[PDB]
Every structure is written in C-alpha cells, then in structure tokens.
C-alpha cells in the first residue's frame, strides 16, 4: 500500500532511487528565493506585507491589485525600485531543481515567483508553469495596443522614477506579473489538467500554500503519490504529516537550501550540486 | 533641482548644513577598519585575499564558505588566530559616525564588517544593520541546540588552537559571521525595505561595493539624494562622478580617517571629533 | 446633539468608520506606559507619589520643582536611576495611535508623559503636543549657555551616580521635562486654539485627569464631540457617562492595551495593529 | 570604597557575615529549576498561545500545552532552599523571579517575600473582572488532564492561570517593590539567569554602585556586570551548577549541614 518505507527524508530518498519514482513535480514559492536576497510575502518582519506602511495604501493588497494600479501606479513602481535585485543569482534550491531536470526526473516546476530565477538556473520554458507570470517582460495595459517592452526598458523607467508610459499610445506599461484581478496564464490551465494524473513525487518548497488555485494543485496528485515539504514552517494544502492516517506526506523543517543539500547528500548528489552552484555563481558574478 | 550646489566635498558639507539634510545613511566596509589594524579583503598585497596560499585551500573563497567550514573548519580558525586584534579600538571614521548619531543626523549605518567597532564607537544596535553579522557572539551550528557563546569563550578557543565545539552537543561552534552559503540577517531585509525611501544623504566609506545584495543598496535611494564616497579608489555600484550627466555623486579619494577629518573641518566639528577620539582611545588603551 | 448611535465602544467604532469622524485627538497620561514598566503617579502603593519617602523631600512635589531642583538636584537623579527603563518599548496603546496617524485620522496626540514612547512608536514632532516636555534631550539650566546633551550622555550620568554638570559652565544639566514652576511649551497654547474647534473624537487614555491645565482640554471640544475614556477607573470631572442626560461620553474600564485591542477589532484593524506591535517589539528586543 | 575585601565567593561570604550585609535580593531564572527537572523554556532544544486576546477566543492550544508541559512533581532544588534559609535567617528582602514553576512558594517563600515577574501557575483566576474567582492548583490540574477547557463555576467564563500573558500589565507588586527594594539592598544574588530579557534584566542596575553582586550560573550573564576588567570592584562570578554554588556558599557561612537537612526532609515529604 504505502510507497514510502518510512515518513522521513531517508524514506523519500530511498523511494527516489527506486524504479517507480520517475516523474517529479516541484511546487515552489517565495521562500526558495529569500537566500537570493528577495524577501518573501508572509514572514513576520522580513516579508513584503510587514513592510508596506510607508506606501500609505488604502489596504495592503492594493499595491498588487490591477484596478488600484491603473488609478495609482506610483506605489507599485516605488516598491519595484526598492526590491529590484541588481543581480539575479539562483539559490542551491533552484539548482537542485536543475539537477532533477538534468537527470530526467522533472515533469514540471509550478512557481508562484516572478523573479525569473528558475529560468536562470537552466529550467526551460517547457519545464515551467509560471503561475504569476514574470517580471522579465512588460506590456502596455490597453487591450487595443499591448506594445511589449523588455526588462532593460522597464528597469530604466523604475530607477529613473518615471512612470512607464507606452511610446505608441501613452497608456501605463505594466510588468507581466499577474496582479490581483487578472486571469491566470493559459499554461496553468493546460498543464494542471494532465501533470497530476501520473506523477510519482511532489516536492513543495518555500510556500505557505495560502492562495488558491495554486494551493489545490497538490490534492490533484494520486492518493499514493508521496509528497515532501521543505519549508521553515508547516504550510496551511491538506498535507497530513501527523495524524494516525498519515502515510505519504513528509515535512523537513528548515531552510530550503539546507533541505536540498540534505536530500542531495542522501541521493549521492551533494558534490555535483555544490560544484554546479559554485560554477554558475562564479559565472553570474563575473 | 540638483540638491548639491557643486560636486565637491565643500558642496556636500554645505548641503549637510542645510535644512533639507535630516537623515543620513552610512554604508561601510573593511576600508574603515584598516587603521584599526584589521586588513581589508581586496587591497593588493595587504588584503586578506592576497594572503591565503599558506592555508592550502581548494579555491580562495572556501575559507569563508559554510559548506567547507562544516567539513574542514581548521583553516578558518587558524586565520582567525592570525587576524584577531589585540585591542578593539575604533577609528576616526567610526567616531565621525558617532558624531552623526549625536547630532541627530544618522538614520542607519549599514556595515559589511564583523569587527564590532561601530558598537564600540557608541552606535547602538538600533542605529546599525550588521549585514555580515558579528564576531561578538558565537553559536553552535546544530539547529536543534544553538547554544550561545560570548567573545571571551570564542577568543580562548582560537588562541589555544582548539576547534570550538559545543559543551552540550559537541557540534561546531561558529562565530555569528554570515559565511558564503548562509542567509543574510533578518534585519537587513526589514531595514532595507524602509530606510531608502526617505534618505537625504548617502555616505559610502571604505568599501569597493563588489558584493550583492549590499552593493545595490545605494541605488534604492531617491534619484535626488546626494551620495559621497570616501575611499582610496572609485568603487566598482552605479555611482556617476565623472560623466557629462553627473549631478549628485562626489568622490573624495584617500584614507577614510583623513576624509572624515576634512569633512568634519568643513562642518566645524574637527576639534570636537579629535577630542572624542583622543578621549575614547585613551579610555580603551587604559583597559 | 448625539453623534454616536449608542454610548458604547461599538458606537464609537461605527462613528470612527463613518465619514463624520475624520479628526481624532488623543489625550494620554502615565497609564498608557505602565505596561512598558514605568509607574504611574497616583495609584496607591504602586504609584510614584506613594514611593517618595526615601528621598527625604520637604514635600512630595519638590522632586519635580525647578526651584528645588537648582538647590538640591540629587533626589531627582536618584529617582531617575530607579525608574529609568531597561528598554524604551512602546505599548499596544502607543501603536494604536501610530495606526491613527497612518490612516490620516490623528489630528494630535497631547501627552503628559515624558517617556518619549510616542516618538519611538513613530509619531512625529508635528503630531505631538508634548505637554510635560521630554526626557529625550537635556539642557544646561543657564540661559546664557543652554548647551544641549543627548539621552546617552544623561543616562551615563544617571547610572554613574554623578550629578550632571555642564562641560562649559558647570551649571546643572536638566532633562527637558517641564518641571513645576516652568512655562508650558508654546505648542500647548498654539495647537489648542485650532485643534479643539475641529476635533471629531476625543480619545482619553491612561490618565486620572487630575492636573490642570491639561485636564481642562476635554471641555474645549464642541459640546457635540464624542469622548471615549479608556482607563482602569472613571477619571476624577466634566465627563458624563452615567446620568439620564448622558449623550456623548463613553467609558471602557480596563487596561489601555486591551481597550485599544478591542477598539481595533471592532474597526477591522486587529491584525494590522498586532503585526505592527510584533515587528516593532521584536526589533526593539534584539536592541 | 570597595565593600568586598576580594572578588571571590570567600569575599562575598565574609561580607555576608559582616553587620553591613543585612538585606539580600535574589534575582533568579530558569537555571535554578533545571536541577528539579523543569525545562528552560527559552532554550531552543528544551506567540498567540501566551497572548490574552487570542486566549479568550481560542483557549484550547494553551491548555493542551499546559497538559504536555505540566511537571510530574513540584520539587524545589538546593538553590531554592538556600533562599528559604536566607528568609529564615532574616536576610531575604525579596526574591524577584522570572520562573512560573511555583518552586519558590513550595520551598516556603511567602507572597510577602516574592515578586513573581511573569506571575505564577500556583493560582488561577476567572477572566471576568466583575467576578475574579480564585481556583487552586488542584482544580486547574483536574481540568487540564480531563482535556476539558476550564470554565468558572459561578459565571462560565474562562479560568486562566495567573501567568502574565502578553498584552497583560505587569503585576502590582513589581511596581510597589521595585521602587523601594533597590535603594537599601546590601547584596544582589543573581542565579540561573542570562539577564537578556527586559525589563527584568534592568533590576540589577537599580542597586547603588557600591552594592556587591554575586552571579551563580553556568556561564557569564550576557546585563552590564564587570567581573574581569581592571576596573572590576564588586561583581563576582561563580561558574558552575546553581546547587553546587549554593552548597559552597552555605559551607563558607557554616550553613551546609542545615541546608542539606532541609533539602533532604522536604524532598522526602514531597515524594510521599
Ligand atoms: C524581480 C523583483 C522585482 C520586484 C517587484 C515586486 C513585485 C512583487 C510581486 C507581486 C506578486 C503578486 C501579488 C502577491 O502578493 O503574490 C503573493 C504570492 O505570489 C502568493 C504565494 O506566496 P508564497 O510564495 O507561498 O510566499 P509566502 O510568503 O506566503 O510563504 C513563504 C513560505 O516560505 C517560508 N520560507 C521563507 N524563507 C524560507 C527559506 N529560506 N527556506 C525555507 N522556507 C522559507 C515561510 O516560512 C513561508 O512558509 O501569495 C501572495 O498572493
Ligand atoms: C574580529 C576578528 C577578525 C578575524 C576574523 C577573520 C574572519 C573574516 C570574515 C570574513 C567574512 C566572510 C565573507 C567575506 O569575505 O566578506 C568580504 C567583505 O565583507 C565583502 C565586502 O568587502 P569590502 O568591505 O568592500 O572590502 P574590500 O576589501 O572589497 O574593499 C575595501 C575598500 O576600501 C579601500 N580602503 C582600504 N583601506 C582604506 C583606508 N584606510 N581608507 C580609505 N579606503 C580604504 C580599498 O581601496 C577598497 O576599495 O566582500 C567579501 O565578501
Ligand atoms: C524615561 C526615564 C523615566 C524616569 C524619569 C523619572 C521622572 C518622571 C517624572 C516627570 C515629572 C513630571 C511631574 C509629575 O508628577 O507629572 C505627573 C503627570 O505627568 C501628571 C498627569 O498624571 P497622569 O498621567 O494622569 O497619571 P495618574 O497616575 O494621575 O493617572 C494614571 C491613570 O491611569 C490609570 N492606569 C494605570 N495603569 C493603567 C493601565 N495599564 N491601563 C489603563 N489605565 C491605567 C490609573 O488608574 C489612573 O487613572 O500629573 C503629575 O503631575
Ligand atoms: C507549566 C505549565 C505550562 C505552561 C508554561 C508556559 C511557559 O519569558 C521567559 C522568561 O521571562 C525568561 C527567563 O529567562 P532566563 O530565566 O534568564 O533563562 P535563560 O535561558 O535566558 O538563562 C538560563 C541560564 O541559566 C543557566 N543554567 C541553567 N541550568 C543551570 C544550573 N543547573 N546551574 C547553573 N546555571 C544554570 C544557563 O547557563 C543560562 O545562562 O525567558 C523567557 O523570555
Ligand atoms: Zn500602448
Ligand atoms: Zn549545541
Ligand atoms: Zn552650560
Ligand atoms: Zn467567574
């Protein structure tokens, strides 16, 4: 019945090495990019939502709300200036997903992040569902124009403190983040309907799973599919680590980078991971 | 529209005297502690990175990487023995920041240094973002223990050439430095998100700004905010001293202590600064 | 005549949410800082005035009287040693006023306290009438000198049990408290004459309203202005909570922190308030 | 003028034997109870759940934790009974305690001897201000172990143990004692505390500059004490076990046998 021999990281690692673990889905969020210097959303003191006071919003969520944006874009672009990283360097956790890809294990990475770090780690477009879009490209908001602008144009406007206006039609230009009030990307719908029918392992990292419909994804997997959480805290998506009925869900509590190193060590991959991280970090820094 | 009347130290000092200049942020590195007997990292011949061959490292950065530390901690602690100062005596530069604090000008000092000298100079923790942590406290590496050990305990282990181990759990004890591979302190995150919205002056001292995310901090300030560099050389993080579009950045090239004395002179603080330094140095010497 | 739909905290909260209430004045005393470890003045056994025997004063008030201070400063500084707080950590009540500022509802906080916790909570100089002055700054008492000294300087003197003397003239150095016999701050008179004519709500917290002229402020608002008292006991004057003629005054009897938490909950601000308190308290606790 | 002849336990004992040392204040924390099998709650190996407004809405988590953390027995240490002997010899002005484990009361310190800084688990009170009914340790325990949320037998409001929850005021006795105790204290005895948490940590700096201060603790306390510098004149650190420090001090005062006898008989009485 139970696919894992025990509900521990060691059990997960032994299952990953067995013949039946062939397709892996990663589900990630802002916690996997904190060690790259990008704050998460909900951590006390450090998270974005604990640092919005000086933007004098009518309510905290307005700064990521499409209707507020169209009326008052200034706070969002001020925030962009304060958070824009100035180097885009993926974490150990990101490179662990790259190893999954290189060893033919990665079916998909579902990400709530907009930082583009999955791509920089070497995950290709087909490997990814960018459920919140991306900062990488920007567009005029007018549906009858939709002129595209690259990262270098948008960055220029952000750091010069000029509100991005479209060069054709003078409408606001917005990064391709899915703001509150905008539709999810088509790839979310297309990929979610097939990926979870036949997946052997879910790896949930650096997310509190507080936002639908992303949170519901883990429940779509087969009943027998083991699920591993690598996170600072127990997240709020129907995982059962503790009950008498617990049979497939494992939590490793701590930093995403440490958890990925620990899992890599059990798999015999730790040296390869650390070499990959060193080489890519060295390259990005040069 | 340009907040400085000219791109000189005199210009910065006059701006600093004006009503508009109320909140100053200092951003500092290892250059401000070389006159306190601690080498910087990147200066040719004298800096730490030109003096690592004898430690027989796989690559230079290994000695400050958490993963290498956990495996082979000996080189780090042998290095700690060679660099640990005989006394902790802040510089003129550190006491200049103390003056900024006492005159109600200092919003924050962001430091890359681990030497605790900002604190010894009388900057309180509230005034500081210790971006690389501190040597002042140490901790057991085990997440399920984290037994705290003071400077005096860590110092004794270093000079007796015994690798620091936990008294409770026998795992490695590490100084609270942020090694390569470790997360930045929480306070960097929280302060970084508010301090740079409303800042009137940046003072960048004794740093080459080669390392992210610290280097990006100066670009978070308003476009209008004047920025003064006091450093031996131009820093390698988006400042524009020399181009035809230069409007707000000023470089004073030389020793940090000398620049701070020059600025203090222009502000009418030189005698007060010199008297504070003399007093505090005598007091520390007397211990 | 009746701007509140009922004389309850819930009525006050619905009035505050409406368009009718745009300008709030807070009037605060020592009760808002008891949970921050500073005693109040009048409470039996626990209050400051019940604990003055050991200072062998000619009479209770002498310790806060300018003329007695100049002749015998020592009891004041020994008292300052005993009450000086371990940290300056504002209470939930302080941060509730911070919320009033951030939502554009705070016309003014009038404070009788000298503990500086309104400032530390993030209320700016412009939001405040510091009616009793402040411990934050100190001055030489001599009119022809008036050298200013910072809190750190004053603390050092307090804990070393050396009476503060000015470095220039050797006159006594006094914290900027408005001692008895001293003129009231200019801001008290100027703000009163424009604030109380357009106030929509008075929030009276942690004060017995026993001392004049501060107590009289509550009668300066228009007769239609609702007034909420959040205090352990009914304040001893002018306010009518209980008679058949009662129409605008509401008492919430209990701890200021708990009263403010209750009011915030009714307003839909509980989480916003608690998040703010938590992040500010965590920051201060890490010094 | 240094009140100690030397900065050692022996110097402290000789000071304690002089007519000058009449009034002792003990400042204690979790380190004094770890020998009684009570866990140091701040130790990482060994916040709504302690907040008053959350408790009134969701009390179950607190009482589930109370069931788990409830000690097998309340059995004070050699250290606690050293304080009992200080009381019995007329030396104890006050014990200021950070612990809620009640071991001071069981050791025979009376409420008049005590300032419980974070309150006490010994008594419980109904949350209604218009009722405020008191309940003993024995009643609260029965509620905790039956896994029924305790309600008041008169008004059906929540009954809460007298721990000072977050968002509650400091106790009255903190204010009334703190304002007089430290002006006339002759010796501070700080035991089993790191002195990192405020406002408790600041209590030691309220004593006069001349007042000797003895630290009995495993480590140096991390709030403004000077054992080592060439200016050191009054602070003494005895490093090791609180029980062993107290035995060694008792021995120098000629109290060791009395202390041992008290400990043994009380331990026996409690076990029975
Ligand atoms: C290139 C950057 C440019 C800057 C421009 C700014 C644009 C900001 C992006 C707008 C995003 C759209 C609006 C929005 O608010 O989306 C949010 C977000 O997409 C969604 C999901 O949130 P999420 O990704 O789950 O992030 P949370 O902050 O809610 O949770 C993170 C979790 O991880 C943990 N954690 C933290 N750090 C670590 C670590 N190092 N190791 C292990 N775990 C870690 C935390 O304990 C926590 O459980 O909820 C929110 O609608
Ligand atoms: C307290 C006991 C000490 C012994 C312990 C030794 C352990 C060392 C711990 C190292 C921390 C690990 C990670 C690490 O390597 O951090 C480094 C560092 O924190 C970061 C930033 O580097 P930084 O602080 O900018 O230091 P640099 O050496 O790169 O730059 C110093 C700059 O200043 C200039 N300069 C020099 N002297 C003067 C002077 N007197 N006046 C004016 N300018 C001066 C130089 O010309 C140069 O531009 O880059 C590196 O990751
Ligand atoms: C920062 C360093 C501090 C140490 C320095 C020491 C110097 C401080 C003395 C400054 C000199 C000022 C002279 C002076 O005596 O001013 C006094 C004072 O400013 C003025 C006004 O008195 P007040 O602020 O109204 O203080 P009271 O004690 O008269 O009344 C406090 C009220 O609050 C209540 N209460 C208590 N706790 C709570 C609580 N937690 N929740 C709710 N309510 C609470 C009490 O029940 C009481 O009704 O009358 C007096 O001249
Ligand atoms: C019971 C029912 C369940 C509900 C209970 C809910 C709880 O607040 C807390 C409290 O105010 C404060 C206490 O700080 P504390 O008592 O100072 O505890 P610390 O951990 O900070 O200090 C413990 C010290 O002691 C030492 N120690 C340890 N054992 C020994 C020994 N045998 N001999 C000598 N020394 C010992 C250690 O070496 C350490 O230095 O920390 C926290 O905020
Ligand atoms: Zn367009
Ligand atoms: Zn340990
Ligand atoms: Zn003077
Ligand atoms: Zn009751």
UniProtKB/Swiss-Prot annotation, chain A:
GO biological-process terms attached to the record: autophagy; cell division; cellular response to caloric restriction; cellular response to epinephrine stimulus; cellular response to hypoxia; cellular response to oxidative stress; epigenetic regulation of gene expression; heterochromatin formation
Modification(s) after translation: Phosphorylated at phosphoserine and phosphothreonine.
EC id: 2.3.1.286, 2.3.1.-
Regulation: Inhibited by Sirtinol, A3 and M15 small molecules. Inhibited by nicotinamide. Inhibited by a macrocyclic peptide inhibitor S2iL5. Inhibited by EP300-induced acetylation.
Disulfide-linked positions: none
Annotated consequence of substituting residue 224 to A: Reduces deacetylase activity
Expression sites by tissue: Isoform 1 is expressed in heart, liver and skeletal muscle, weakly expressed in the cortex. Isoform 2 is strongly expressed in the cortex, weakly expressed in heart and liver. Weakly expressed in several malignancies including breast, liver, brain, kidney and prostate cancers compared to normal tissues. Weakly expressed in glioma cell lines compared to normal brain tissues (at protein level). Widely expressed. Highly expressed in heart, brain and skeletal muscle, while it is weakly expressed in placenta and lung.
Consequence recorded when altering residue 61 to A: Reduces binding for the peptide inhibitor S2iL5
Catalytic activity, reaction form: N(6)-acetyl-L-lysyl-[protein] + NAD(+) + H2O = 2''-O-acetyl-ADP-D-ribose + nicotinamide + L-lysyl-[protein]; N(6)-tetradecanoyl-L-lysyl-[protein] + NAD(+) + H2O = 2''-O-tetradecanoyl-ADP-D-ribose + nicotinamide + L-lysyl-[protein]; N(6)-hexadecanoyl-L-lysyl-[protein] + NAD(+) + H2O = 2''-O-hexadecanoyl-ADP-D-ribose + nicotinamide + L-lysyl-[protein]
Domain named Deacetylase sirtuin-type: residues: 2-270
Induction conditions: Up-regulated in response to low levels of glucose and anoxia-reoxygenation stress. Up-regulated by trichostatin A. Down-regulated in response to high levels of glucose. Down-regulated by histone deacetylation in several tumors.
Domain of life assignment: Eukaryota
Keyword Phosphoprotein: yes
Localization (cell): Nucleus; Cytoplasm, Perinuclear region; Cytoplasm; Cytoplasm, Cytoskeleton
GO molecular function per UniProt: chromatin binding; DNA-binding transcription factor binding; histone acetyltransferase binding; histone deacetylase activity; histone deacetylase activity, NAD-dependent; histone deacetylase binding; histone H4K16 deacetylase activity, NAD-dependent; NAD+ binding
Cofactor(s) this protein requires: Zn(2+)
Cofactor note: Binds 1 zinc ion per subunit.
GO cellular component: centriole; centrosome; chromatin silencing complex; chromosome; chromosome, telomeric region; cytoplasm; cytosol; glial cell projection
Outcome (variant: residue 113 to A): Abolishes deacetylation of alpha-tubulin. Inhibits deacetylation of histone H3 at 'Lys-18'. Inhibits the block of entry to chromosome condensation and subsequent hyperploidy cell formation in response to mitotic stress
Protein name in the entry: NAD-dependent protein deacetylase sirtuin-2
UniProt organism field: Homo sapiens
Gene symbol of the encoding locus: SIRT2
Residues shown, of full length: 56 to 354 of 389
Curated annotation (Swiss-Prot), chain D:
Cofactor binding: number and manner: Binds 1 zinc ion per subunit.
Catalyzed reaction equations: N(6)-acetyl-L-lysyl-[protein] + NAD(+) + H2O = 2''-O-acetyl-ADP-D-ribose + nicotinamide + L-lysyl-[protein]; N(6)-tetradecanoyl-L-lysyl-[protein] + NAD(+) + H2O = 2''-O-tetradecanoyl-ADP-D-ribose + nicotinamide + L-lysyl-[protein]; N(6)-hexadecanoyl-L-lysyl-[protein] + NAD(+) + H2O = 2''-O-hexadecanoyl-ADP-D-ribose + nicotinamide + L-lysyl-[protein]
One GO term of the biological process aspect: negative regulation of autophagy
Result for mutant: residue 202 to A: Reduces binding for the peptide inhibitor S2iL5
Known cofactor(s): Zn(2+)
Broad enzyme group: transferase
GO-annotated cellular components: centriole; centrosome; chromatin silencing complex; chromosome; chromosome, telomeric region; cytoplasm; cytosol; glial cell projection
Active site residues according to the UniProt entry: 118 (proton acceptor)
Mutagenesis or variant effect for residue 196 to A: Reduces binding for the peptide inhibitor S2iL5
PTM comment: Phosphorylated at phosphoserine and phosphothreonine. Acetylated by EP300; acetylation leads both to the decreased of SIRT2-mediated alpha-tubulin deacetylase activity and SIRT2-mediated down-regulation of TP53 transcriptional activity.
Tissue: Isoform 1 is expressed in heart, liver and skeletal muscle, weakly expressed in the cortex. Isoform 2 is strongly expressed in the cortex, weakly expressed in heart and liver. Weakly expressed in several malignancies including breast, liver, brain, kidney and prostate cancers compared to normal tissues. Weakly expressed in glioma cell lines compared to normal brain tissues (at protein level). Widely expressed. Highly expressed in heart, brain and skeletal muscle, while it is weakly expressed in placenta and lung.
Tree of life domain: Eukaryota
Annotated GO MF terms: chromatin binding; DNA-binding transcription factor binding; histone acetyltransferase binding; histone deacetylase activity; histone deacetylase activity, NAD-dependent; histone deacetylase binding; histone H4K16 deacetylase activity, NAD-dependent; NAD+ binding
Recorded consequence of changing residue 43 to A: Inhibits deacetylase activity
Residue stretches making up the Deacetylase sirtuin-type domain: 2-256
UniProt keywords, alphabetically: Acetylation, Autophagy, Cell cycle, Cell division, Cell membrane, Cell projection, Chromosome, Cytoplasm, Cytoskeleton, Differentiation, Immunity, Innate immunity, Meiosis, Membrane, Metal-binding, Microtubule, Mitosis, NAD, Neurodegeneration, Neurogenesis, Nucleus, Phosphoprotein, Transcription, Transcription regulation, Transferase, Ubl conjugation, Zinc
Regulation: Inhibited by Sirtinol, A3 and M15 small molecules. Inhibited by nicotinamide. Inhibited by a macrocyclic peptide inhibitor S2iL5. Inhibited by EP300-induced acetylation.
Induction: Up-regulated in response to low levels of glucose and anoxia-reoxygenation stress. Up-regulated by trichostatin A. Down-regulated in response to high levels of glucose. Down-regulated by histone deacetylation in several tumors.
Main location: nucleus
């Amino acid at each position: 019945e139970r696919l894992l021999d025990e509900l521990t990281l060691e059990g997960v690692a032994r299952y990953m090495q067995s013949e039946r673990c062939r397709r892996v889905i990663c589900l990630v969020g802002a916690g996997i990019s904190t060690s790259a210097g990008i704050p998460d959303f909900r951590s006390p003191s450090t998270g974005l939502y604990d640092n919005l006071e000086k933007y004098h919003l009518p309510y905290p969520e307005a700064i990521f709300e499409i209707s507020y944006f169209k009326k008052h874009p200034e706070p969002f672009f001020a925030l962009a200036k304060e958070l824009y990283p100035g180097q885009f360097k993926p974490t150990i956790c990101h490179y662990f997903m790259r190893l999954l890809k290189d060893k033919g294990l990665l079916l998909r990475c579902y990400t709530q992040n907009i930082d583009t770090l999955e791509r920089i780690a070497g995950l290709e477009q087909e490997d990814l569902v960018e459920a919140h879009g991306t900062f990488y490209t920007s567009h005029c908001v007018s549906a009858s124009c939709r002129h595209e602008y690259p990262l270098s144009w948008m960055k220029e406007k952000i750091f010069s403190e000029v509100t991005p206006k479209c060069e054709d039609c003078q409408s606001l230009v917005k990064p391709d983040i899915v703001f509150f009030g905008e539709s999810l990307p088509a790839r979310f719908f297309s990929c979610m309907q097939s990926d979870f029918l036949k997946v052997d392992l879910l790896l949930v990292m650096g997310t509190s799973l507080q936002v639908q419909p992303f949170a519901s994804l883990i429940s779509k997997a087969p009943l027998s599919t083991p699920r591993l959480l690598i996170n600072k805290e127990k997240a709020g998506g129907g995982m059962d680590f503790d009950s008498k009925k617990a049979y497939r869900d494992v939590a490793w509590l701590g930093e995403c980078d440490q958890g990925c190193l620990a899992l890599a060590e059990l798999l015999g991959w730790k040296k390869e991971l650390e070499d990959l991280v060193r080489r890519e970090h060295a390259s990005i820094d040069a």
